[PDB]
Amino acid sequence: SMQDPIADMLTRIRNGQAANKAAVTMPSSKLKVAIANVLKEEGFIEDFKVEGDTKPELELTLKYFQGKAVVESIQRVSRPGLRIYKRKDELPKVMAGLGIAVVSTSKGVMTDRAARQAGLGGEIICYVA
Amino acid sequence: ATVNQLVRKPRNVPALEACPQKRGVCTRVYTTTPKKPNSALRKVCRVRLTNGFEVTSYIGGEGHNLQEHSVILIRGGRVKDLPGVRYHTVRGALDCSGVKDRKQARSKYGVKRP
RNA sequence: GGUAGCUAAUACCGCAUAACGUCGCAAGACCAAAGAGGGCUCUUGCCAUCGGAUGUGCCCAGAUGGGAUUAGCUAGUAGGUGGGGUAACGGCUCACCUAGGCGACGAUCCCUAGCUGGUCUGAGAGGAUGACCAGCCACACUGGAACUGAGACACGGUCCAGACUCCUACGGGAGGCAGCAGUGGGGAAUAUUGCACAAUGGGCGCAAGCCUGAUGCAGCCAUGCCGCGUGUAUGAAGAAGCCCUUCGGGUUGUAAAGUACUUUCAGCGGGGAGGAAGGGAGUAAAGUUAAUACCUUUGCUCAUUGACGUUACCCGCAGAAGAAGCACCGGCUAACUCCGUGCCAGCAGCCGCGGUAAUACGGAGGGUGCAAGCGUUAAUCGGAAUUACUGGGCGUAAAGCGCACGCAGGCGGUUUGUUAAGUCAGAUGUGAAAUCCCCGGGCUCAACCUGGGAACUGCAUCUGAUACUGGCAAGCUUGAGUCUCGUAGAGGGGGGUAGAAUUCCAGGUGUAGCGGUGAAAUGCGUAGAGAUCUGGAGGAAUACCGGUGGCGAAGGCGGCCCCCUGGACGAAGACUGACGCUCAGGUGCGAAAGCGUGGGGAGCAAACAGGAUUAGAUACCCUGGUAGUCCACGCCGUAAACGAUGUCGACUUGGAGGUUGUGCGCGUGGCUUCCGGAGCUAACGCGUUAAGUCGACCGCCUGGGGAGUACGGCCGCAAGGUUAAAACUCAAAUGAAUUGACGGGGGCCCGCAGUCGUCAGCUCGUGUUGUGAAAUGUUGGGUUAAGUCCCGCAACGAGCGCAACAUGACGUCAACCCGGGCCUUGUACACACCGCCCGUCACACCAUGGGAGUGGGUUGCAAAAGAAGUAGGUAGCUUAACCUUCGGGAGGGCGCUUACCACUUUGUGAUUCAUGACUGGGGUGAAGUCGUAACAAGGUAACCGUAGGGGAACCUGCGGUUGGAUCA
RNA sequence: CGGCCGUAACUAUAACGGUCCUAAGGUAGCG
Ligand SMILES: CN(C)[C@@H]1C(O)=C(C(N)=O)C(=O)[C@@]2(O)C(O)=C3C(=O)c4c(O)cccc4[C@@](C)(O)[C@H]3C[C@@H]12
Ligand SMILES: [K+]
Ligand SMILES: [K+]
Ligand SMILES: [K+]
Ligand SMILES: [K+]
Ligand SMILES: [K+]
Ligand SMILES: [K+]
Ligand SMILES: [K+]
Ligand SMILES: [K+]
Ligand SMILES: [K+]
Ligand SMILES: [K+]
Ligand SMILES: [K+]
Ligand SMILES: [K+]
Ligand SMILES: [K+]
Ligand SMILES: [K+]
Ligand SMILES: [K+]
Ligand SMILES: [K+]
Ligand SMILES: [K+]
Ligand SMILES: [K+]
Ligand SMILES: [K+]
Ligand SMILES: [K+]
Ligand SMILES: [Mg+2]
Ligand SMILES: [Mg+2]
Ligand SMILES: [Mg+2]
Ligand SMILES: [Mg+2]
Ligand SMILES: [Mg+2]
Ligand SMILES: [Mg+2]
Ligand SMILES: [Mg+2]
Ligand SMILES: [Mg+2]
Ligand SMILES: [Mg+2]
Ligand SMILES: [Mg+2]
Ligand SMILES: [Mg+2]
Ligand SMILES: [Mg+2]
Ligand SMILES: [Mg+2]
Ligand SMILES: [Mg+2]
Ligand SMILES: [Mg+2]
Ligand SMILES: [Mg+2]
Ligand SMILES: [Mg+2]
Ligand SMILES: [Mg+2]
Ligand SMILES: [Mg+2]
Ligand SMILES: [Mg+2]
Ligand SMILES: [Mg+2]
Ligand SMILES: [Mg+2]
Ligand SMILES: [Mg+2]
Ligand SMILES: [Mg+2]
Ligand SMILES: [Mg+2]
Ligand SMILES: [Mg+2]
Ligand SMILES: [Mg+2]
Ligand SMILES: [Mg+2]
Ligand SMILES: [Mg+2]
Ligand SMILES: [Mg+2]
Ligand SMILES: [Mg+2]
Ligand SMILES: [Mg+2]
Ligand SMILES: [Mg+2]
Ligand SMILES: [Mg+2]
Ligand SMILES: [Mg+2]
Ligand SMILES: [Mg+2]
Ligand SMILES: [Mg+2]
Ligand SMILES: [Mg+2]
Ligand SMILES: [Mg+2]
Ligand SMILES: [Mg+2]
Ligand SMILES: [Mg+2]
Ligand SMILES: [Mg+2]
Ligand SMILES: [Mg+2]
Ligand SMILES: [Mg+2]
Ligand SMILES: [Mg+2]
Ligand SMILES: [Mg+2]
Ligand SMILES: [Mg+2]
Ligand SMILES: [Mg+2]
Ligand SMILES: [Mg+2]
Ligand SMILES: [Mg+2]
Ligand SMILES: [Mg+2]
Ligand SMILES: [Mg+2]
Ligand SMILES: [Mg+2]
Ligand SMILES: [Mg+2]
Ligand SMILES: [Mg+2]
Structure with a gap:
């Protein structure tokens, strides 16, 4: 079963960057948003947004510099x-x-x-x- | 191994008895053939030590003076081409004489300085 | 020792006194003492009480080895009440009451062990360790006991017992170096039967001082660390003598000599700190005081105190004089030659070296490294990420349980509130000193000594923070589950039935063969087989459909029909509200073989018999054939039970199929197969059904063997399964891939089918591919006598061969049959199949299992025993202090007795160690005997489980696996 | 429910071989 939503968020980012995805989406949470805020402010992701209410979904806009993904690890x-x-x-x-x-x-x-x-x-x- | 598994369950000279030398009495003195690819008559001896263990010891250098009932000091050191020979006799200690007419590495063969 | 007499006190005992003391709710009651010294005064001691300080006793929590091949342990046991006991709380003890207490967070039992500060190692985290120094504990010949005392159950005290040993007049007595020194003994190994209390400290004393093997010192030992010396300069004659040499020379070697010098340290002789503070003398003033006394204190002055010691250190004398070794030089690893030897002698840490030109053995010359040491052995950590917390693995190298369910445990979607356990912050206390580290200081320097700091990563307490984790409360629907409708399916259990075929039986027709093989023979047949037709019996399995098809957790499941029954999937909602995931132990299911009881038995077929084959043939082949294969019920619990790949969840380009739903050619689910991208991987390969990227939990690995074996436990009717070592032995074993060679593998060709061979091969440069060995080119489609030529092609060119103008490429052999060429494939071969290699048997040595038993250690249980001591009791005996009416009394002691208990004794278990006729395998050891099992299709594909058989490898049956070659 | 003789790199023994004969040459276990 799903027992670490944060590891899942990190993996979605890691796998998204490796696949050259523009954005990655996932089930939201207050802690995921708090982490997404730090990633944005430090310039690892471009932007994030939460959409929904009963089942909110967090979308992260990934960023690439000279082709390469910015989140190298x-x-x-x-x-x-x-x-x-x-x-x-x-x-x-x-x-x-x-x-x-x-x-x-x-x-x-x-x-x-x-x-x-x-x-x-x-x-x-x-x-x- | 997982952390939980580790929490549950964490991660050649026996006759000397961790002494540098042991004294012994020669119970047999003989020659033996080395294993392949070597050929020689290698001078060995069965030795009953002061702690009661009986072991084969090697007699090094050119020519020796050991009989049955000779009292020798052994040290560690296997002889590669004699399986089950794990000890060397100290030359120039107790009964075992110095090697006759040695001039180099004299201190290894118990030979006083000419 | 005994008896009698005598005597003192700060010895002992009343009496008095008696409260911020003890008992008591209070009233009350009750309890002490000692003098001595100097000249009334001072000093000191005595008693009481309350404080301080120090020391010690006691309690709690956490931490502090190993073993589950120890899982249950406990009766003062766990708690309570009351009495007693202790300095004190307390089952500390006793009586009674309750039936508790401990334990998988490892109790109990077994093995090992003093703990810590620290020490060694390590980048750290760790690992190893606890000698010296300091803190704590424990012990004092062994077992037990108390007494005295503030304190002991007392190292140089007491009592008893025991084992030893010694003196004796034989009646009895005596002793305890694990103080210092020393002796014997054990051992590879560890020192003098020294000097002094001068210093520091300790006991006693007002002090002087006395005592002090503490301590300060000296002796012995290169045991370590640190410092210094063993000369320095010059010096070609490049002297001899070495050694090597292409006899030119080279090198040792400026080395030596010779010549200038120097004199540390050693020797000899003279000077000279410091460790000495104090204490002793009369005198000086002041304070106590009747006193300008004694005493106290401080000054004052004069003598005087050192074991070390012939001190440190300094000055002078003489003369290079008295002072250099050890290991190494094949690679790893700094350093190379000659001679001797000839698989010998020998070396060796590992690989290896030595069989006539040895840098590896032994000597020499030269050299390298260390140096008053150098080597060797032992031992710890490191390197070893080789137990991986930091920091590893499990498709094929060692490693995923055969599969599932599931308790404990670990982990836990999302929102709000609350709490503040985790976590975080700050503060306070503590974390001994030494050690380590930093900055300083002192010994001429250093080692060493030392000042201050830092550090001691910890622990506790208090006050805060509240994101995350946990607790609590309330939710939420996305995980998980329920319901409704439908779908496919060899899912399971039970019962019935059909058709084909084999065998057998009965009968007809028919007549000489049948059957079988590579060829045979055994076998069957004129007693009529085989063939053919008809009727019957019986068992087992279900052709076609049929499929990389379907279903099942796995094992597995296949004609058709019915009955009972499990799961999966889809559609559209509704419902519950984290109910979840994983799972040690546990429990269940679990192919084939096998086992038990009862049935059944057509076909097939271990064993077995006969026939062949063969050198033999316990096989393969043939003819038969029993268990078994089938059914019921029970057991076994294993397989290459395999995807050699644990379960659950999330995420991450594509292509082509299969199967099964479903919505409007186009979607959307489930299951499944093949290819391949990134990525991953040692490579092979895997690749949305991951071996990719992550998270949760479990299982498992740690070189090859010995061994999945022994022992013990558990399970089993047995076969056996399961859990699971050690000694010992080797330097490898192993995986994948590469180039060859080889195959009783495949394809395609050639030849009357010095050497291979006049065979058509063999290579290189550059480029490209691969981590790499290597590959490509040189392969491929054609064609040729020909790598000949053409065409294609990550190759582009070139050389030697071919050809052309007898001619022998690079190399090999330390000279249908045979030979050869090209491509491909398997390989455990590389000395390259004349290869490799398995097991019994034989011999030697080593460790080890079983074993009638034999001898010790430890220990459980049940009793016996009862020294001394302490406590309780007390007919007897006896009596300093108090009381008395003088008779005695109180109280005491002795003796006796009871309780507890050491020695010791007996019986019976457990466990461990040693050993044991004989017996089992295991390991090692150039060339033994018997075969040839495996590696190629290894000549019968191999292997796994199981069963039976066999000198041995093995063979055969049944099921399973591919980790099998082959298909032109 | 058998004889005979030979055979292993020290001996010794014989896993092995030959030979003869039998209806078949005694297995497991035990001694
Ligand atoms: C001490 N400890 C508990 C040991 C252990 O851990 C074992 C293990 N498998 O892990 C044992 O088997 C161990 O427990 C054990 O049982 C041992 C043995 O049985 C034996 C036997 O029977 C004979 C010789 C040697 C051994 C042994 C050395 O292997 C024993 C070791 C034991
Ligand atoms: K050799
Ligand atoms: K008790
Ligand atoms: K009580
Ligand atoms: K430690
Ligand atoms: K004792
Ligand atoms: K006292
Ligand atoms: K003193
Ligand atoms: K790890
Ligand atoms: K919280
Ligand atoms: K559970
Ligand atoms: K049968
Ligand atoms: K490769
Ligand atoms: K598991
Ligand atoms: K081993
Ligand atoms: K090339
Ligand atoms: K081939
Ligand atoms: K044995
Ligand atoms: K025994
Ligand atoms: K075979
Ligand atoms: K088999
Ligand atoms: Mg008194
Ligand atoms: Mg009184
Ligand atoms: Mg163990
Ligand atoms: Mg065992
Ligand atoms: Mg009480
Ligand atoms: Mg207590
Ligand atoms: Mg001990
Ligand atoms: Mg390390
Ligand atoms: Mg100690
Ligand atoms: Mg320790
Ligand atoms: Mg007392
Ligand atoms: Mg004493
Ligand atoms: Mg003593
Ligand atoms: Mg002593
Ligand atoms: Mg001795
Ligand atoms: Mg004395
Ligand atoms: Mg070198
Ligand atoms: Mg030579
Ligand atoms: Mg070592
Ligand atoms: Mg390590
Ligand atoms: Mg590894
Ligand atoms: Mg394997
Ligand atoms: Mg494996
Ligand atoms: Mg599996
Ligand atoms: Mg499960
Ligand atoms: Mg949560
Ligand atoms: Mg807290
Ligand atoms: Mg400290
Ligand atoms: Mg919370
Ligand atoms: Mg059904
Ligand atoms: Mg049935
Ligand atoms: Mg069966
Ligand atoms: Mg049966
Ligand atoms: Mg048959
Ligand atoms: Mg047959
Ligand atoms: Mg298995
Ligand atoms: Mg299977
Ligand atoms: Mg399969
Ligand atoms: Mg497996
Ligand atoms: Mg399926
Ligand atoms: Mg693929
Ligand atoms: Mg077993
Ligand atoms: Mg067993
Ligand atoms: Mg070629
Ligand atoms: Mg050509
Ligand atoms: Mg070409
Ligand atoms: Mg030509
Ligand atoms: Mg050709
Ligand atoms: Mg034994
Ligand atoms: Mg008594
Ligand atoms: Mg074979
Ligand atoms: Mg074969
Ligand atoms: Mg095979
Ligand atoms: Mg097995
Ligand atoms: Mg057979």
């Missing part, structure tokens, strides 16, 4: 079978700072850089580069 870190939490000092650097780690903190989902500047740890959702 995207990996689930914390997962249902093994949750991963880090203190502020132990927050991971992705690609020596050139990538992002998405972190769920008590002040919402944000990048590792924003968590570190806010002085927060949290759950490491995924690495993006």
Whole structure:
């Protein structure tokens, strides 16, 4: 059964980029939208939008630069079978700072850089580069 | 292996008894043929050690002085072309004499300096 | 030791006193003490109570080895009430009451073990480890016990017992180095029967001081770490002597000598810190005080205290004098020659080296690396991502349970609220010192010593945050499920029935053969077979349809009809509201063979018999033929039970089919087959039915063997299944693919069918393909005597051959039959089929299973036993302190007795170790014997399970698999 | 429900072979 919707979102992006899809759609959730917001603000995806009400669908517009997909890697870190939490000092650097780690903190989902500047740890959702 | 599986279930010289040498008494002294592709009369001896283990030991160098009831110091070291020979005799220790007329690698054959 | 007498106290005992003490609700009641010293005064001690500090006892949580081939354990056991007990809570103890308590988050049992700070290794995470130094614990000849005491159940105390050993007048007595030194013993291996309390600390003492094997030092040992020396400069004669040499020379080697010098360290002789603070003397003033006393304190001055020690260190003397070795030089790996040897002698970490020109053995010359050390062995981590948390795998290399259901467990769609367990933030406390690290400081430097910091990643508590996870509450419909209508199907169970055929029986016709094979023979037949026709009996299986077809969880399921019954799928809604996924253990299903009981038995056919074949033929072939194959019921629980591919979910270009629904040629579902894209893969290949990209959960792997074996457990009627090691042994085993060669594989051709061979081959450059060995070209369609020529073609060209003008390509042999060419295919071959290779048997050695038994260790259970001690009781005996009416009394002691309990004894189990006639296989070891099972279609395709048979590999039956060649 | 003789790279033994004969030469197990 479906036991990790976030890993599914990341995979839809990974597989979408590898297949040169313009957009990818999926069942929405508040956490998926929170992650989509971070990906947009850091410039990994172009745009997102939620459509529906009873069964909302999240669409992500993927971005390509010089033919190549911009999301070169995207990996689930914390997962249902093994949750991963880090203190502020132990927050991971992705690609020596050139990538992002998405972190769920008590002040919402944000990048590792924003968590570190806010002085927060949290759950490491995924690495993006 | 999954994390849950690991949580449930996590990941040649025996007669010396982890000593550098052992003393022993020669119970038989003989020659034996090496395995293929080698040919020689290789000088060995069965040795009962002070800990009660009986083992075959190799006698190295050119010419030896060991009988039955000779008291020798063995060390680790197999002889590749004698299966089941896992120990060497120390030359120039206890009864076992130094090799006669050696001039190079003298300290390996118990030979005092000319 | 005993007896009698005598004597002191800070020994001992009342009495008095008695409250911020004890008991008590209160009223009350009750409890202590010691003096000594200096000259009344000071100092010190004594008692009580409440505090401090320190030490110690006790409780809780988490953490701290291995084993399930230990799953149940527990009766003071778990809790309660009350009495007792302790410094103190407490089953600590006892009586009674309740029937609890512990355990898969591993109790109980077994094995190993002192724990920690740290230490070694490692980039880290880990792994290994706990010697020295410091914290904690435990023990003191062995077992037990208490006494004294603030503290002990006491290392150099007591008592008892035991095992030892020693003194004795034989009656009895004595002892405990795991203090320091030392001895014997064990061992590969670990030091002097030293000096001193001078320093630091400890005991006692007002102090002086005494004691202190703590400690400070010295001795021994290259055991380690660190520092220094063993000369320095010059010096061609390129001396001899080496060694090598194409005899030119080269190299050692400026090396030596010779000549200038230097003198650390060692030796010898002279000077000289520091570790010494203090303590002792009278004097100085002030404070206590009747006092300018004694005492206290601080100053004051004078002597004096060092085990180390002939100290560190300094100065002087003499002279290169007294001081260099060890390993290595085939690759890995820094360093090469000659001589000796000739698969010998020997080397070896691994691969290997040695059979007459050995950089590998042994010596030498030269060289390389380390250096007062160097090597070797042992041991740990590393490299090893080779147990993979960080950080691995499972189609074919080792690895997906045969398939399913499912409890525990893990995981969990979406929204809101709440909570704040996880998580996060901050603060506080703690995290000993040493060690590590950083910046400094001190020994001439270094090692070493040392100041401050950082660190100690942790733990706890408090206060906050609320995204995510969890809890709780309320929902939602998208996952999952229910209902309605219909569809296809060898899905299952039961019963019936049909037609074809085989065999048999009866009878007719008919007459000499039939049957069988490579060829035969056995066999059947004139007692009439075989053939043919008619009638009958009986069993088993269902031609065609039929299909990479369908159904089933898998195993599996096939004529037709009925009865009972399971699942799947589609359409259109409605309904429930996360009800889900996975699943250790558990449970069920599970081909064929096999087993049990009862039936059945046509055909087929293990075994078996005969006939052949063959060197033999326990086979293949032939003629027969029993179990079995069939049915009922029960068991077995395994297969190459395979897609060699676990289940569930999501996502990611295409093409061509099959099958089965359904909506309007065009859609849309389910199941299924082939090809192929990205991607993935060692490659082969896989490729929306993934071996791609992800998530959840499970199963499984960790070199080849030994071995899926032994032992133990469980299961089974048995056969056996299941769980599952170790010693030992090798440096490989293995997968995929490549070039050859080879095939009793295929296709196509050729030849009277030195060498192969006058065969038509063999190669290269550049380009391209492949991770790569390699490939392409050179293959293909034709044609030729010919890689001859033409045409096509990721190849484009070129060379040697052919041809042309006897001529022998590159190389090989360390010279239907035969030979050869081209393409393709299988291969376990590469010494290339004259290949490789299997098992019994024989011999040697090694480890090991079973085994009548034999000898120990540990331990359960049931009893016996009862030293000493402590406690309880007490007819007897006895008595310093208190009381007394002087008779005694209270209280005590002894003895006796009871309880608990050590030694020890007996019986009976368990477990473990050692050993054992004999017996089973296993492993290793150039060239043994018997065959030839496997690899090619391996000459009968191979293999899996099972059964039977056989000297051995194996053979045969039944079902299964392709991991089988062949088809022109 | 059998004789005879030979045969393994140390011996020893004989998995093996030959030979003769039988209706068939005693299997498993046990000794
Ligand atoms: C100690 N431990 C529990 C061992 C273990 O883990 C085993 C295992 N399969 O994992 C055992 O089999 C193990 O439990 C076990 O049973 C062992 C043995 O049975 C034997 C036997 O019977 C004979 C010789 C050697 C062994 C052994 C060394 O393999 C034993 C090892 C045992
Ligand atoms: K050799
Ligand atoms: K108790
Ligand atoms: K109680
Ligand atoms: K540790
Ligand atoms: K003891
Ligand atoms: K005391
Ligand atoms: K002292
Ligand atoms: K891992
Ligand atoms: K929450
Ligand atoms: K479950
Ligand atoms: K039959
Ligand atoms: K390839
Ligand atoms: K599983
Ligand atoms: K092994
Ligand atoms: K080429
Ligand atoms: K061929
Ligand atoms: K044996
Ligand atoms: K035994
Ligand atoms: K065969
Ligand atoms: K078989
Ligand atoms: Mg007193
Ligand atoms: Mg009183
Ligand atoms: Mg085990
Ligand atoms: Mg076992
Ligand atoms: Mg009580
Ligand atoms: Mg308690
Ligand atoms: Mg111990
Ligand atoms: Mg590492
Ligand atoms: Mg210790
Ligand atoms: Mg430990
Ligand atoms: Mg006391
Ligand atoms: Mg004592
Ligand atoms: Mg003592
Ligand atoms: Mg001692
Ligand atoms: Mg000894
Ligand atoms: Mg003394
Ligand atoms: Mg080199
Ligand atoms: Mg030579
Ligand atoms: Mg080692
Ligand atoms: Mg490792
Ligand atoms: Mg691996
Ligand atoms: Mg295989
Ligand atoms: Mg395999
Ligand atoms: Mg399977
Ligand atoms: Mg299931
Ligand atoms: Mg959730
Ligand atoms: Mg919290
Ligand atoms: Mg510390
Ligand atoms: Mg919540
Ligand atoms: Mg049906
Ligand atoms: Mg039936
Ligand atoms: Mg059957
Ligand atoms: Mg039967
Ligand atoms: Mg037949
Ligand atoms: Mg037959
Ligand atoms: Mg199996
Ligand atoms: Mg099958
Ligand atoms: Mg199949
Ligand atoms: Mg399998
Ligand atoms: Mg199907
Ligand atoms: Mg494909
Ligand atoms: Mg077995
Ligand atoms: Mg078993
Ligand atoms: Mg060619
Ligand atoms: Mg040509
Ligand atoms: Mg061509
Ligand atoms: Mg010519
Ligand atoms: Mg040709
Ligand atoms: Mg045995
Ligand atoms: Mg008694
Ligand atoms: Mg064969
Ligand atoms: Mg065959
Ligand atoms: Mg085959
Ligand atoms: Mg088997
Ligand atoms: Mg047979």
